[PDB]
Amino acid sequence: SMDDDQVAFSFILDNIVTQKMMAVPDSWPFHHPVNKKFVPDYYKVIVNPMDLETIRKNISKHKYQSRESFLDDVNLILANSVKYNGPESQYTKTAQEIVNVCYQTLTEYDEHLTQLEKDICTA
Amino acid sequence: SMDDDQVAFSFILDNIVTQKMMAVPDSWPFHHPVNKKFVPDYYKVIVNPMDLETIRKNISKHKYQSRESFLDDVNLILANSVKYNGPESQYTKTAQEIVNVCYQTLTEYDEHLTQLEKDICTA
């Protein structure tokens, strides 16, 4: 955590979220936990909610040491939207675009992220 | 088929399935229709089953003239796994890697696929 390699890794993840994922058009409903005021049954339907703010808080606490656990939480946003909104919902298409810009940016950064992941583990 | 644009389009889709999607680790359960011998209630729960072999058979018969109909079947695999296995299931995570690498590869081939789609449409 105090390790600069961990901090640099978390910093890159945070910027995937703020520069790319939160920039998806109409993505605001995914930026924060679902508000039960407007979606009253959400937490009765969805057992493990996930949203971009929760991921950013995990990043700020250095809870991700490799990209797989980060991508697992990102993917959960989409899977939850398939369950709640439906597989063909406009919201699900937006969530898949959030996933796509994340996944594809992770691919672009593969060699950089691999080095950081190794240096986090070594430390 | 004798239309070379359609054949080339299908050929590219087929290679997205065999080179990328079927190469996902532990993805074999998605390669063929679910075997009810091992998953006895599957077809009682899932009304529109889908799998990668069925998609490949559709590709061989040139069912897809654009990426949209192809993606509809790809996303149906994921929708079925969210419903049957749950949003957090290891199987759903595998399905999401299949879907995610599919979108990423389609984006990589965008310039080829857009031209082919237009040349199929004009005819």
Swiss-Prot record, chains A, B:
Location in or out of the cell: Nucleus
Annotated organism of origin: Homo sapiens
Highest taxon, organism lineage: Eukaryota
Upper taxonomic lineage: Eukaryota, Metazoa, Chordata, Craniata, Vertebrata
Comment text on domains: The Bromo domain mediates interaction with histones that have acetylated lysine residues at specific positions. The second domain also recognizes and binds histones that are butyrylated and crotonylated.
UniProt-recorded name of the protein: Transcription initiation factor TFIID subunit 1
Gene that encodes it: TAF1
Domain Bromo positions: 3-109
Disease: Dystonia 3, torsion, X-linked: An X-linked dystonia-parkinsonism disorder. Dystonia is defined by the presence of sustained involuntary muscle contractions, often leading to abnormal postures. DYT3 is characterized by severe progressive torsion dystonia followed by parkinsonism. It has a well-defined pathology of extensive neuronal loss and mosaic gliosis in the striatum (caudate nucleus and putamen) which appears to resemble that in Huntington disease.
Subunit organization: Component of the TFIID basal transcription factor complex, composed of TATA-box-binding protein TBP, and a number of TBP-associated factors (TAFs), including TAF1, TAF2, TAF3, TAF4, TAF5, TAF6, TAF7, TAF8, TAF9, TAF10, TAF11, TAF12 and TAF13. Interacts with TAF7; the interaction is direct. TAF1, when part of the TFIID complex, interacts with C-terminus of TP53. (Microbial infection) Interacts with SV40 Large T antigen.
PTM: Phosphorylated by casein kinase II in vitro.
Function: The TFIID basal transcription factor complex plays a major role in the initiation of RNA polymerase II (Pol II)-dependent transcription. TFIID recognizes and binds promoters with or without a TATA box via its subunit TBP, a TATA-box-binding protein, and promotes assembly of the pre-initiation complex (PIC). The TFIID complex consists of TBP and TBP-associated factors (TAFs), including TAF1, TAF2, TAF3, TAF4, TAF5, TAF6, TAF7, TAF8, TAF9, TAF10, TAF11, TAF12 and TAF13. TAF1 is the largest component and core scaffold of the TFIID complex, involved in nucleating complex assembly.
Signal peptide: none
Family affiliation: Belongs to the TAF1 family.
Part of the whole protein covered: 1522 to 1642 of 1893
